[PDB]
Design a protein around this motif. Sequence first.
Motif, PDB file in Angstrom:
ATOM      1  N   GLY A  22      60.323  62.505  51.461  1.00  0.00           N
ATOM      2  CA  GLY A  22      60.731  61.943  52.579  1.00  0.00           C
ATOM      3  C   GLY A  22      62.052  62.190  53.280  1.00  0.00           C
ATOM      4  O   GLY A  22      63.106  62.075  52.503  1.00  0.00           O
ATOM      5  N   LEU A  76      55.316  54.208  53.553  1.00  0.00           N
ATOM      6  CA  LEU A  76      55.059  55.101  52.576  1.00  0.00           C
ATOM      7  C   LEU A  76      54.147  54.526  51.592  1.00  0.00           C
ATOM      8  O   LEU A  76      53.078  55.357  50.959  1.00  0.00           O
ATOM      9  CB  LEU A  76      56.524  55.160  51.876  1.00  0.00           C
ATOM     10  N   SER A  96      65.406  57.792  53.662  1.00  0.00           N
ATOM     11  CA  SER A  96      64.353  57.799  52.824  1.00  0.00           C
ATOM     12  C   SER A  96      64.648  57.570  51.388  1.00  0.00           C
ATOM     13  O   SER A  96      63.739  56.861  50.636  1.00  0.00           O
ATOM     14  CB  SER A  96      63.530  59.091  52.928  1.00  0.00           C
TER      15      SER A  96
END
Length: 267
Positions: A22, A76, A96
């Motif tokens: 991420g 996510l 992230s």
Amino acid sequence: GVVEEAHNVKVIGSGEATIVLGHGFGTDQSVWKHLVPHLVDDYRVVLYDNMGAGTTNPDYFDFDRYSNLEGYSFDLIAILEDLKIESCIFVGHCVSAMIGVLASLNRPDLFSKIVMISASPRYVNDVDYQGGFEQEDLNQLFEAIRSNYKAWCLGFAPLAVGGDMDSIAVQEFSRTLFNMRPDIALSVGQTIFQSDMRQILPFVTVPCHILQSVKDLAVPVVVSEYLHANLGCESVVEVIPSDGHLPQLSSPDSVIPVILRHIRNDI
């Protein structure tokens, strides 16, 4: 499906053994270009883009959903569920890292390990905490974004990336930054820079590896030590002799071996 298309999901490589990467503010999955080659023979690798990245459709940016980091954590979890991933190693750059942490509070079962690159739970200083910024510094940053976005991008990119101001990495980040719609860049920058994840760190249960450049404009080295002291899980810190807030992009020869070691080896 729509979720995979909207976040530009890519799945490469082979294994129940799965790594999910991420990216941070102002970049996209391309930030991982020097890491992915060294993972794909040993892991299934998942790449995705955060909603509001320049590579994503601005019609899907819901200012309410993304007014806190929880919106991104729900994205996510959605991606992991859509791909039928039961467990992954999550590598989180910049915001992230905290998105991953928050997702792990809701669904610790989905993460075996978090590896953080250039993470911070809080950017704003207070009398007993050094994050790197006074609120007045942030106020000026937000005003520059509003006033002239391109000018702001060209000034910000060399500072965030570090190293030589004419590097390929500086040019690359300047381009991804300016790819964002200006209103979204401002909103997201405010959400991240004003965030406070400090209070939830004792609740984390998944082991964390805390990696950063020794010189990072947005992350004083004491932040790594704060994460290590306050996370409720097992953790380890490794400060890298690198410059920059996107060091996996700009200094791969020194940084990629460190990231690989923390992916490949458990605490």
